Symmetry: D2
Subunit: 264 residues, 4 copies
Amino acid sequence: MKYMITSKGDEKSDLLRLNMIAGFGEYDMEYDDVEPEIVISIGGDGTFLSAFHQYEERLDEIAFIGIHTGHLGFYADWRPAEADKLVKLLAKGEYQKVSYPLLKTTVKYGIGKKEATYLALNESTVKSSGGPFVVDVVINDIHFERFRGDGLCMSTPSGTTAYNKSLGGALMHPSIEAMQLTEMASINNRVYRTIGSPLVFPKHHVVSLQPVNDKDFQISVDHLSILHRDVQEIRYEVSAKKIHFARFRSFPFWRRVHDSFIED
Amino acid sequence: MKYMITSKGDEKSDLLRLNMIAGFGEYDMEYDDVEPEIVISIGGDGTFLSAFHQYEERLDEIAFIGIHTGHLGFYADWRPAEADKLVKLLAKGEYQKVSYPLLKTTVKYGIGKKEATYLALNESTVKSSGGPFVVDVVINDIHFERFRGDGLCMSTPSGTTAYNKSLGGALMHPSIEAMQLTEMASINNRVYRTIGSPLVFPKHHVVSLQPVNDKDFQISVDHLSILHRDVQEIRYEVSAKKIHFARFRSFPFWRRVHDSFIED
Amino acid sequence: MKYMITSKGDEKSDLLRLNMIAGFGEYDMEYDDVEPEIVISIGGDGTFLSAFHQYEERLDEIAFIGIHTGHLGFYADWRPAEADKLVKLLAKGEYQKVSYPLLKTTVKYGIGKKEATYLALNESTVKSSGGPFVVDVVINDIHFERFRGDGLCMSTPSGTTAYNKSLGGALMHPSIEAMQLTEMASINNRVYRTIGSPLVFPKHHVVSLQPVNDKDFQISVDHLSILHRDVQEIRYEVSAKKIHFARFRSFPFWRRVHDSFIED
Amino acid sequence: MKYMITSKGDEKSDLLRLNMIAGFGEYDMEYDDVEPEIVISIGGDGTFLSAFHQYEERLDEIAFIGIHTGHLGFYADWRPAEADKLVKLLAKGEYQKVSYPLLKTTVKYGIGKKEATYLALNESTVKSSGGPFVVDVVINDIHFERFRGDGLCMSTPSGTTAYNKSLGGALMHPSIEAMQLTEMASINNRVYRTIGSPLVFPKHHVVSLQPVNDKDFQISVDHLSILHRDVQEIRYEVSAKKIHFARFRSFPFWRRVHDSFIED
Ligand SMILES: NCC(=O)NC[C@H]1O[C@@H](n2c(C#CCN(CC(=O)O)C[C@H]3O[C@@H](n4cnc5c(N)ncnc54)[C@H](O)[C@@H]3O)nc3c(N)ncnc32)[C@H](O)[C@@H]1O
Ligand SMILES: NCC(=O)NC[C@H]1O[C@@H](n2c(C#CCN(CC(=O)O)C[C@H]3O[C@@H](n4cnc5c(N)ncnc54)[C@H](O)[C@@H]3O)nc3c(N)ncnc32)[C@H](O)[C@@H]1O
Ligand SMILES: NCC(=O)NC[C@H]1O[C@@H](n2c(C#CCN(CC(=O)O)C[C@H]3O[C@@H](n4cnc5c(N)ncnc54)[C@H](O)[C@@H]3O)nc3c(N)ncnc32)[C@H](O)[C@@H]1O
Ligand SMILES: NCC(=O)NC[C@H]1O[C@@H](n2c(C#CCN(CC(=O)O)C[C@H]3O[C@@H](n4cnc5c(N)ncnc54)[C@H](O)[C@@H]3O)nc3c(N)ncnc32)[C@H](O)[C@@H]1O
């Protein structure tokens, strides 16, 4: 139906996009970047994340597809050589959609109410604004720990192969509706203690970070990173919303992991 | 109904057991260690694991309860001081059961067929029988990696706070039906590569370990450790069977984790 | 001889300082904070680091002593209760000095020459100024790796129990004239590789960090953190300079470590 | 002078050995495997370790050289293609020797005195004989920790790229006269605490492991692994003895590390 194509913007990706637009012109496919039904990302995983956040208000009406023009992007399940086969199978349709869970981040501020919510496909992280980073971690209203260190990272399942992995987190198959919290350089001695281990939470569990001294934090959501001031609370939970991928052939997650980290 | 009580066997635990037997005698409670309906473990987590494996053929007909006479056992949710309240609330009943997932281990041998299956509440591990440990890891029939190192550990959710934790694994809430694979001292250089990260698998995923040279392995299931010879394959999957706990009050998993590792 | 006392500035530390000044008044001790010969720090390890950097141009003419008014500071080897014994043994003298190695950091800039050097007692770290952090690591003019991640930390021996420890670094006895490099959340996949392991360098080895794209970095030296622009190179080596401590009794490093992390 | 050549024993290494023997026959070189002065190892690092232990009573009278017939052995600094250049430069001599530190392991037994000492080029490790592994760690007669876990590894500097590396240890340049202790899967909770971090000790420091319950341990020294019974103490210290290598060209340790783990 309606489709759109976002491009990394280098010469290689722009030309692939133009050629795919020409190929779609031979079918009942209409280019519309306002309310598309298929969103094709041509570039890398960064390009795909921007595509996701470009259309995160219409997630349930869109199936995403990624083409990697550089090396294998984790959200890319297509090489540029297969772009014509992509046009054709997409044109005919009859594909099946797969859904990965997402992370909801709520940021509460002081001096009254006011709230901001964000959706993450990889992760959301919290760091301080220059000084020391100290937050109380509250799990389902239960005070769990006082964290002192560089920061905290909350990952989706498909995010576990990204920042989460570099922090020592586990890789979880994206059929598991969960989120995973990992530490960044916690201090542990006689007076300061954190769990250390990554923590994996199911749906409906709420993880709340609460300031202890400084109330300014650098908060990231995927690629976006903003300094938030007068923060009262940061709440993490598995979103009710999901991202849908258009799948045309079997490419299992664990094979995707193998290709990306073991050999290809 | 029918109940039984297993004891660590020290003076403290035997006397608590005898006193609980006397208290149960004042109700319609019948001691039967053949087909009990409630199994009470008095001791530590080792005592509770033995209780579980003592009755693993009647898991769906039994609710387990643990009393820790030493420090807080992770499967113990009762102190000895509360044993009388335990007798009474157990006597009246009306409690609710909670269920944790279990791990199925299948060991296939050569020189014909023959198979052995085991159930694990904490984990199952594989090490070599003296020489180097080398196995191919196959996930859902897909060759994932060739592991060279000291061994591998596959953990249940409630097991993730045990051996899994010491190996760098994530802690997962036991409502998640999953199993987690962690490495023991893998070698990684120009010629040998493993994923490194712990891996978390959902139900219905099968992880198969396959010998490369030596076919003898030391295989553990919770406390039991046996040398298996002429092994053709070791298969891991989340069991369809579950362990049921009798719960009388709220004691959340993450509070249990906090009490055991942060402070109490 | 000449001495001075720096204070954390809370009520507890200021009063201890005034009382020690009064006690020193009963001996041939002269207060001089311009060219002191003994520098006493009253507070925590942060207070001691400021004391060190206050007098880092006269390191070879000064013996440092730390009193911890809070919990045991790692550079503090005296409790407040022993302050009078400190005055007296310091007054009589005859103590012996011990020396720990230091880290030299040289920052070279572009648009001409120009250089800045800094001395570190704990560590020096490098992070990016917002964007991705990518540096080439060059050891004794040999290209070792291209690091992609959050940053790098170079620690002195006595620094290894601080930030270095939280990053997974080894603890090294301060009689070893060395420096230790640890990674902060490196990315490792098919295209990006770092060593992962902490690296320990002897004297006369030079570790050079060289920019790949962005040339702006946040560089810390102990507590001081500055954004450096137009950076051409960051060079690390074990300093020829050393910090001298006044020692009055045996308090071994490994006992100091035990008291700080195991139990006290 | 006198030389000998040990071979991995595969067809490739035996033939290289025979060809080198023929080449040495054209010089004043005499084959003697009783009191050689040059020991050439042809194979892998395992072959080189056997060569070292074959002649560990004449370490100060021997210079070692390694040829790797498989991939780059860490103690191999020669490819098979350069074997003739090796013969010739060795024949002429005038090379310079380099020395790496070694680890001394002393095992004391009960039921009287009796002692066994061993020399290690890579490491010495301690594990239990089946049951739980619990030892008290005593550093220079100071009780440091009670270790509960899978075992402990004490590495030389050149050993730090081997088992030590897989356990999270730091890589240290072999000019540093030190040894490094790393944990194997320590348990850490409310009642059990270890340092966690690897520990690096200078010369003259003594690390003593002392049994708590079971007195039987599996003790390894490089490739050799023996069950020791009635053990009273295991003592580690940097040896006064050193291994000498014959060096013909510059091949820096950090380049050796880069070639072995980053790329080649
Ligand atoms: N200049 C492009 C670049 O090299 N970026 C990151 C690399 O990671 C890969 N990757 C991404 C991605 C992405 C896009 N980037 C950049 C952009 O959006 O511009 C934002 C993400 O950065 C991650 N990240 C940040 N810091 C670190 C760190 N220290 N260590 C590891 N990852 C880190 C966070 O998670 C961000 O979400 N998602 C996944 C995934 N799901 N699975 C597996 N791999 C993934 C990319 O293919 C690429 O190889
Ligand atoms: N002598 C008793 C002893 O100290 N044993 C182990 C300790 O671990 C606790 N623990 C147990 C348990 C248990 C019983 N034991 C002994 C027995 O059965 O005799 C078998 C298990 O050993 C574990 N284990 C083996 N090696 C290591 C290691 N290197 N590091 C960490 N744990 C290790 C494995 O997982 C076995 O299943 N299950 C859990 C859990 N679910 N959550 C949190 N904590 C748990 C116990 O309270 C106790 O503190
Ligand atoms: N508000 C005071 C505070 O809690 N600060 C840090 C804590 O660490 C201890 N500590 C210090 C110190 C110090 C002073 N601070 C503060 C100041 O100067 O204001 C600067 C240093 O911060 C360290 N640091 C930074 N980020 C992290 C992190 N993520 N994880 C661990 N440590 C971190 C760096 O290395 C800095 O040098 N040097 C050592 C040492 N040698 N041995 C053992 N312990 C040490 C202090 O007793 C204190 O418990
Ligand atoms: N079948 C041969 C094999 O693959 N063996 C080990 C591999 O490690 C390399 N290696 C060796 C070596 C060696 C010889 N072997 C075998 C033999 O002697 O037969 C004994 C050593 O095993 C190590 N080892 C044991 N367990 C583990 C483990 N879990 N993880 C990592 N290493 C482990 C210990 O340290 C032993 O000393 N010393 C070093 C070094 N200095 N630097 C860097 N790399 C080194 C070898 O090139 C080889 O690639």
